[PDB]
Design a protein around this nucleic acid. Structure first.
Length: 454
RNA sequence: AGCGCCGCAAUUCAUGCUGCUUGCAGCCUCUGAAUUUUGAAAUGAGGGUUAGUUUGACUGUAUAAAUACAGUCUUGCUUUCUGACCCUGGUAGCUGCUCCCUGAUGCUGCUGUCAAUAGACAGGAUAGGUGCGCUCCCAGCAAUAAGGGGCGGAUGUACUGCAGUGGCUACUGAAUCACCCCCGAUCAAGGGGGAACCCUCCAAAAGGUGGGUUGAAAGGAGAAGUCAU
DNA sequence: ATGACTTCTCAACCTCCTAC
DNA sequence: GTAGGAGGTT
């Protein structure tokens, strides 16, 4: 639900970058391409066309002969792990797309393929003599890498180092299931210029981080969920490898109860009856209402001009840019609408926290096309009362001047920002032919009625 | 003139205002919602220029909670706007076509000085518009196997025109800056000096010691297909 | 060939081989 | 002999 990627840049002298480029681009990327092709020619793919699922063992079984091949001989085992993880994720995504929508598919790109680290223990964080946080992976451990990141992400790497030190200083009595780092990706940003490829492309890292583990009080929720899941797994499981796995899990239960020296923050105890609802239209991208769901009195309405206070110019800039790109496309992305959606999501979450709202509701994407069409028809009727030609011309001009808002990105941003504090995301039926504040209030009451029925 | 945007005034009000009657009454000082009008405040600028400031993390005190204060550490990632800065270009190579009239469509439009003019030299984004941009109009322009008229070269129904049009690449020039300069580093590291303002001490004053200011925001990433034209 | 949608994913303990 | 690095394995 809540998993935040953390950016960093790995910096070292020339020999390290040269070794990484000569070991990944020359070996690892062709290795991944070979796995892709060889599973493409696998006879079971047609069988995998019948049902959209993949065994977790066949990929490793196919990759095992290539490990001993002289072409792909020199590489750490964790990098083979990375290659098979990448091919498994890619083919699982392909199978999921094929199943939902119900053949060579090699990626065409100049940059080398990412290195994925599913095991968080692979990277070893160590403070440098100067004060930086050198990091090295499982394998190629003597090629260190200083991390560069902003002050807004330095605490994540500091807690990576702190968690590793607490694990090492406790004689491995702590568990890695509570580590705030889960997954890692090593790529290049394709720095523009001229020179050697290893000395030209900036090497960067993405660290998948679970925010629910940030606070000591929040770690308890993750601990309880993991304990319940693994207890269900072990009670369903009840064979040498199976016995080894069950003993590992039963040791993980004992290991997960150890205390971590983490900051403690009060959990967001939002009132279950104070709903906050978001309504999306075309004349105004979003309006917010706060209701009590017990006494039908609205605590606060909020227009988009208040959520974007001191930033409302950016909405007009986004609309102008969208019109310009539409005109250019008709004649033959600035990544600003995403920023606007994130601003709106943060403003709505801050509003809900300030008014002590325990649940945020926002409409589904399925009804959005009908909502846009109804809004266009309603505004055309409001402008031109009765004659069809006037409403049609006004609707055409209005749609040409201003386009839709790409609401799904806003939905994702709201969900991601609400998962940070712990506000329940809910859906509701968008009402038709009403004021945006009236629409938001009716959506909130409909959501409360649906929750009452459930 | 149609449409879209800012806020100027007015009206109805609250998501606002005080006392509570804590749910009803009045009001528009502030913050905002809906409608009409409107060209004195705002939106609005052609191409780029940063290891760019802040929006950070932790520990305590107060608000029972938003939040503020005090202390410690600090880092440079993907962005987003404002402000400031240089130019509206110079070289070489490769490469599509071809005319008189009539188009759809599309491009250009700043200021000053010589030349009627093409074309040169300066300034310089306040770049043709109602306050502001646009698939909208205001002018000029424009190429082609879009239509028509063909002419010469030319034996032929055969081919060319009747010096201009677009695209690509390498070397490349100015900013390589968030008060402004100097030096230095550009997979690494900053150092030095100076102007204005504010606070405190010394201090008759002038001045000197110590500190700060000289913009503000947001963050989930990887790979893939799908759809619409 | 170009902007949104979406479904996948976001491991964890254990064992063997060095070092002074 | 404990601490750290490389590899397994579902």
């Amino acid at each position: 639900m809540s998993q935040i990627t953390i950016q960093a840049r790995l910096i070292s002298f020339e020999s390290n970058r040269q070794q990484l480029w000569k070991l990944m681009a020359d070996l690892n990327t062709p290795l991944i391409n070979e796995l892709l092709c060889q599973l493409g020619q696998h006879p079971d793919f047609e069988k995998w066309q019948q049902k959209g699922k993949l065994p977790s063992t066949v990929v490793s079984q196919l990759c095992q002969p290539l490990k001993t091949d002289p072409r792909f001989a020199g590489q750490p085992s964790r990098l083979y792990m990375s290659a098979i993880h990448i091919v498994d994720y890619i083919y699982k995504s392909w199978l999921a797309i094929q199943k939902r929508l119900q053949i060579l598919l090699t990626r065409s790109s100049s940059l080398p393929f990412p290195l994925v680290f599913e095991t968080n223990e692979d990277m070893v964080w160590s403070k440098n003599q100067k004060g930086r946080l050198c990091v090295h992976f499982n394998g190629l451990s003597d090629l260190i890498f200083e991390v560069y990141c902003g002050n807004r992400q330095l605490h994540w790497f500091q807690r990576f180092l702190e968690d590793q030190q607490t694990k090492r200083k406790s004689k491995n009595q702590h568990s890695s299931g509570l580590f705030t780092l889960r997954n890692g990706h090593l790529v290049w940003l394709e720095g523009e210029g001229k020179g050697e490829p290893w000395n030209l492309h900036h090497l960067t890292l993405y660290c998948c981080v679970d925010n629910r583990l940030w606070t000591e009080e929040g770690t308890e929720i993750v601990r309880q969920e993991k304990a319940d899941e693994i207890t269900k797994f072990i009670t369903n499981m009840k064979s040498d490898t199976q016995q080894a796995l069950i003993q590992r899990k039963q040791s993980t239960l004992t290991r997960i109860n150890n205390s971590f020296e983490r900051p403690s923050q009060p959990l967001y105890q939002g009132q279950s009856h104070i709903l906050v609802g978001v309504s999306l239209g075309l004349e105004k991208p979003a309006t917010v209402a706060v209701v009590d769901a017990i006494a039908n009195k609205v605590l606060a309405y909020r227009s988009i001009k208040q959520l974007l206070g001191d930033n409302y110019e950016l909405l007009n800039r986004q609309r102008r840019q969208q019109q310009y790109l539409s005109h250019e496309r008709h004649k033959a992305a600035s990544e600003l609408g995403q920023h606007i959606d994130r601003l709106l999501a943060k403003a709505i979450v801050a509003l809900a926290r300030t008014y002590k709202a325990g649940s945020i509701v926002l409409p589904k994407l399925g009804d959005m096309r009908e909502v846009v069409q109804s809004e266009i028809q309603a505004i055309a009727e409001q402008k031109f009362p009765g004659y069809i030609e006037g409403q049609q011309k006004y609707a055409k001009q209005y749609r040409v001047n201003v386009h839709r808002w790409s609401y799904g990105r806003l939905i994702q941003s709201i969900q991601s920002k609400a998962a940070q504090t712990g506000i329940v995301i809910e859906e509701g039926k968008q009402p038709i032919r009403g004021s945006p504040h009236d629409k938001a209030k009716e959506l909130a009451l409909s959501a409360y009625n649906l929750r009452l029925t459930r």
